[PDB]
């Protein structure tokens, strides 16, 4: 709703008086089904999803991470609508300091480069952004904030239901004599993630 | 400040430079380690307790897994947190009630039981040799004049009366739900209370329970003896929820 | 020959059609600050005769900081909207390039262009990317920045007192900023952007809910009473959040829950602390 | 006791009027279960509140005036001290909020003014003063306030009460201005500006503190520009607030435009939502006088001196 | 002070409220003293200019 | 099996400070604010009893507690510790009454309580209490208002404030309050100085007030607090 | 080396061995006179009209420094600048007092 609709069914969004969503960030225990969501989204939606593992963006050439980000939003800015999907932001995710190595300064800027684009003056249009992380405890205050990230999307460890629900999905392609102990497996299976 | 530490203020129960007690906070964290959630709702003429009954294995006598305890024939409690600590605190509560009746010649009020237990845990908070208990007790019972009562005590020494409360993993969410559903002002009958509590837990966990996945304690004005509902009557309450 | 006023800065005057748009309207409940910038640039920039005669000494650069969402980037959009001079939007994250001199070459440009345009607003969103004090000459990356600072520094005070060019720098972490920046001359007026309170919120709420329609019975008052301390920005996640809930079920205009959800959807910071500590 | 009230309230809340209901209201006070009437009197007050505005719906607040002494003794034998402050503040207030004889107000006010002392909670004694000084200004007698306020200057400062000091400075300043003294009155307004800055503001009060300055900026003719900036804001206040005084400032806000010779900004002032919410004799006037000017005609202005003087005659 | 037989001084201290006029007394004298008046704080900018980093404050 | 740590946890720093005491005071200056005014014919204590929700029953725990029939208490800081001190103060009061068959003087109860607080800065194995107490009393015609801090030191006040923003509250009291005040006016200025911080619509269940005149100490009913909160 | 900080109680001991900070001089807060003087110096910068009693201003002042006063003056001008008036009467200053003592009372 936040992401797909505000594109093919935003023409009436203004009829409520609300700009399309801004950004969405998964954030959950390692294995809650985050990385599998970006895949499912770009597979179904299909439009212009550009995935950035937020790691291979870093180089070493002064502002080599500023140009990558500029081109990312530029390409997209022109090419929009486009989905921006960043895998693990904890990299550029950062948090700032006071301070750290002369290296950290590079990331920050770079960490800021995006922040200034997501908001700043020129107003993102059509092009939307999915933020990815495991552990959101690390992120900069100035990033989580609306105008940058709209609403955070939590993905908790599947319930006994969610387990069972997911359990019959991965074990569905297995040769199993009329003895499938789904209610037993799921039961003992607690705190167990999706993988 | 804002997270500052000095000396042993994160190991024993002494003051941090910003005036915190870190071991107590850690005890609160220890409550959630059980991975359970309990809901307590006070009615016009009753009090209801409800709790997940996680019996992960059929190799366990499912009758011996209970977080509901009889403190007195007319005072019930539900424990949330570290199991063995919970039982310790239950024994202490039992003793304090019995002793109260023996010295004062009337039945202990939940208010004073909770206050007593709390008072005991504050000592753990203030003495260095021992560590707080990683548990949380919620007491219910009918007082002679104040009507139905639900109280709750913490690992630090805090205790309070409630219209409705919860403890454990989904505490904040259950409080949000309940504080939404209390403002609506409805005739809090018995079934209204039971349904409210059960649905609070159910929606908070998104489960829709079997009658063997939860346990429901109760106390009424018409029947003040703390009664633990059989699986049958629980189910009777369950099927009535898939009607409206 | 002497190339007339040119070069990157990097764009050049924004143009006109690229207006920040955000009209003074949207930006509400910010008199002091609002007035402050107005008092810092808008007015001082225009009426110069009372700055010299009335013995006022106008300021050269203005610093904007505070929490992240209290509304500084809006303040620049508003100024570039009503404005009249030449609003240069140069990001401090662009100055450092893959070249050994590009940075100064720009500053000499933006500053060069500023002189040429007219009473122009140079605006630097997030000067952190340039000025972060704790420099380190050796990494061969710091060297480039420091100078960029020195560049900013040199052309920062090099003007003439007459050069009608104001400097507007926005940053939340108003801390990792070499004091060399905040010195009477380079960055005089220092302005703060609080995370609203009660009244302000009312203006922020009323202004946010004034863009849509909504149930006229309801009263975003209940919410304003609360503390939470929601920033001017977050209050926006709610207004938008309500639409998602009101639109997800199809229905022009919102409901109680639409805000309730928003309040529970935005605030988030439910717990926080403990009840014994007080 | 309770038998009547709620049922009577349920009867009252229905329709008819307080006056019929007064037979119950008066009876509420007159009755019934002789609780004390403790809570009843509070609810009898609930009438005497309504019943007061119902008293006003007829003019017995003069009745209740004398009874106000009795009600005192009546809460005195049932209503605690505090209970009086609230009960004794719902009569002197709701009574002043209505247009009637100055005396009965002054008479009663003065009464209860002196009552606070005989009881002795200087806190209310000062609060009631604001009304006593304000009423002495509108009523007629000016020299009266002069002494009252000049005695009240240290009555709020001792505690540093801040908004009451401004009120007396604002409110009292007006008395001086009318007494034909813009120097002193002016000086009084200036003093308030400095005092008002020390503390919060807050809203309405701040509007008087503005408009009033707009007034002084037009009392001696000192650029209708500096005054206009007070009228505009001071209009904004009453606008997004009680909206009772806002209707007043719109007038002066337009005055500056009429003098400045800009009927364009007057067109700007007449736009529906902003004020037009008032459409009446306040806008029609200044509009007709404005474009009447643009025509640079005198015949026209003369006729707008004629037909719309119903307000113009009532001004200072 | 040499003529009196007393080791002249080198170091001074100024202590009080913050913002009453201490730097001035250090600047004004220094100004009125025709002596280079230096302001050594801890800015990395300053070290890169004056001192090529070196390793201390000598 | 168990004994007790026998060594002091509160020890002198090289500067000569008892660091744990100042950190305990830091815990006090983080609790809900409380104001106390001695007013010629009586004493007023008030405090912010602000909950976290609508679920907590505010008619169940109180912060303004009676010690005897003529002495009352409020606190700033940690709750449980306050509870302990209140029990102990009631006990001390009753010891005194057994022995002298005369209700304990407010100064003496303050002394005794303070001694208890000082013990936990010198006995072994413990932290100091994280509580400041305001103790009001009526004895010998005059009214009495004392404060005791975690060090075990006590001071007599005409008026004072503790907890969050206690400095601004204190200044406000220094200005907007003076002698010859009747208890009613004192209640007024107390709720007034509490409002200088209460972030909320100060209701009749958001604050707790107690009085102490020469008719005994008592807690003001929610009704009475509503009446007083109606200005 | 002039090393001029605040609260001598902050500086270490090794920096106090009686001989090592030749002349230890201390700054006093600024009273009516000093302020008055300071007040006259800063107000001299801007265009100040007649009928301006500065003393009255420092009297209202209570706990300011060498910088604070500067803020007051500036605002006085700042206030007059907004009033569209080149000069700066006494009233203005009397406001700035608060406006600064607003800040003086603020953070
Ligand atoms: N809800 C789920 N349904 C099916 N498979 C899942 C689910 N969650 C996790 N998995 C398994 O784990 C993988 C997804 O891991 P992922 O969510 O990317 O972890 P992380 O969040 O640490 O990146 C999938 O390839 C799948 O095999
Ligand atoms: N009083 C207000 N009026 C209008 N918008 C506001 C107000 N307060 C907050 N906002 C909203 O919050 C956002 C503020 O963004 P901004 O302050 O630029 O963040 P940053 O400091 O990270 O650039 C804007 O989108 C603005 O609409
Ligand atoms: N005695 C004084 N007379 C006039 N101005 C002063 C005085 N003391 C300080 N100031 C003002 O303070 C500013 C410099 O403050 P300074 O004293 O250097 O800071 P600090 O208080 O940290 O020493 C100057 O602009 C000056 O106007």
UniProtKB/Swiss-Prot annotation, chain B:
It comes from the Eukaryota. It is found in: Cytoplasm; Nucleus. The modification N6-acetyllysine is found at residues 101, 103. The modification Phosphotyrosine is found at residue 158. GO terms for biological process: positive regulation of canonical NF-kappaB signal transduction; proteasome-mediated ubiquitin-dependent protein catabolic process; proteolysis involved in protein catabolic process; regulation of inflammatory response. The modification Phosphoserine is found at residues 16, 62-63. Glycans are attached at residue 4. GO terms for cellular component: cilium; cytoplasm; cytosol; extracellular exosome; mitochondrion; myofibril; nuclear matrix; nucleoplasm. One of its GO terms (molecular function) is RNA binding. Component of the 20S core proteasome complex involved in the proteolytic degradation of most intracellular proteins. This complex plays numerous essential roles within the cell by associating with different regulatory particles. Associated with two 19S regulatory particles, forms the 26S proteasome and thus participates in the ATP-dependent degradation of ubiquitinated proteins. The 26S proteasome consists of a 20S proteasome core and two 19S regulatory subunits. The 20S proteasome core is a barrel-shaped complex made of 28 subunits that are arranged in four stacked rings. The two outer rings are each formed by seven alpha subunits, and the two inner rings are formed by seven beta subunits. The proteolytic activity is exerted by three beta-subunits PSMB5, PSMB6 and PSMB7. Interacts with ALKBH4. Belongs to the peptidase T1A family. NCBIfam families: PRK03996.1. It comes from Homo sapiens (Human).
Curated annotation (Swiss-Prot), chain C:
GO terms for biological process: blastocyst development; proteasome-mediated ubiquitin-dependent protein catabolic process; proteolysis. The modification N6-acetyllysine is found at residues 257, 261. GO terms for cellular component: ciliary basal body; cytosol; membrane; nucleoplasm; nucleus; proteasome accessory complex; proteasome complex; proteasome regulatory particle, base subcomplex. ATP binds at residues 66-73. The keyword Nucleus applies. GO terms for molecular function: ATP binding; ATP hydrolysis activity; proteasome-activating activity. Keywords: Acetylation, ATP-binding, Cytoplasm, Nucleotide-binding, Nucleus, Phosphoprotein, Proteasome. Its main location: cytoplasm. It is found in: Cytoplasm; Nucleus. Component of the 19S proteasome regulatory particle complex. The 26S proteasome consists of a 20S core particle (CP) and two 19S regulatory subunits (RP). The regulatory particle is made of a lid composed of 9 subunits, a base containing 6 ATPases including PSMC4 and few additional components. Interacts with NR1I3. Interacts with PAAF1. Interacts with TRIM5. Interacts with ZFAND1. Belongs to the AAA ATPase family. This is 26S proteasome regulatory subunit 6B. It comes from Homo sapiens. The chain holds residues 141 to 418 of 418 of the full protein.
UniProtKB/Swiss-Prot annotation, chain D:
Changing residue 13 to A: Does not affect phosphorylation by AMPK. This is 26S proteasome non-ATPase regulatory subunit 11. The modification Phosphoserine is found at residues 13, 22. It is found in: Nucleus; Cytoplasm, Cytosol. Phosphorylated by AMPK. Component of the 19S proteasome regulatory particle complex. The 26S proteasome consists of a 20S core particle (CP) and two 19S regulatory subunits (RP). The regulatory particle is made of a lid composed of 9 subunits including PSMD11, a base containing 6 ATPases and few additional components. The keyword Nucleus applies. One of its GO terms (biological process) is proteasome assembly. Keywords: Acetylation, Cytoplasm, Isopeptide bond, Nucleus, Phosphoprotein, Proteasome, Ubl conjugation. It comes from Homo sapiens. The lineage of its organism: Eukaryota, Metazoa, Chordata, Craniata, Vertebrata. One of its GO terms (molecular function) is structural molecule activity. There is a cross-link at residue 273 (Glycyl lysine isopeptide (Lys-Gly) (interchain with G-Cter in SUMO2)). It comes from the Eukaryota. GO terms for cellular component: cytosol; extracellular region; ficolin-1-rich granule lumen; membrane; nucleoplasm; nucleus; proteasome accessory complex; proteasome complex. The chain holds residues 2 to 317 of 422 of the full protein. Induction: By FOXO4; expression in embryonic stem cells (ESCs) is mediated by FOXO4.
Curated annotation (Swiss-Prot), chain G:
It comes from the Eukaryota. It is found in: Cytoplasm; Nucleus. Component of the 26S proteasome, a multiprotein complex involved in the ATP-dependent degradation of ubiquitinated proteins. This complex plays a key role in the maintenance of protein homeostasis by removing misfolded or damaged proteins, which could impair cellular functions, and by removing proteins whose functions are no longer required. Therefore, the proteasome participates in numerous cellular processes, including cell cycle progression, apoptosis, or DNA damage repair. Belongs to the AAA ATPase family. Component of the 19S proteasome regulatory particle complex. The 26S proteasome consists of a 20S core particle (CP) and two 19S regulatory subunits (RP). The regulatory particle is made of a lid composed of 9 subunits, a base containing 6 ATPases including PSMC5 and few additional components. Component of a complex with USP49 and RUVBL1. Interacts with PRPF19. Interacts with TRIM5. Interacts with NDC80. Interacts with PAAF1. Interacts, in vitro, with the thyroid hormone receptor (in a thyroid hormone T3-dependent manner) and with retinoid X receptor (RXR). Interacts with ERCC6. This is 26S proteasome regulatory subunit 8. The chain holds residues 291 to 397 of 406 of the full protein.
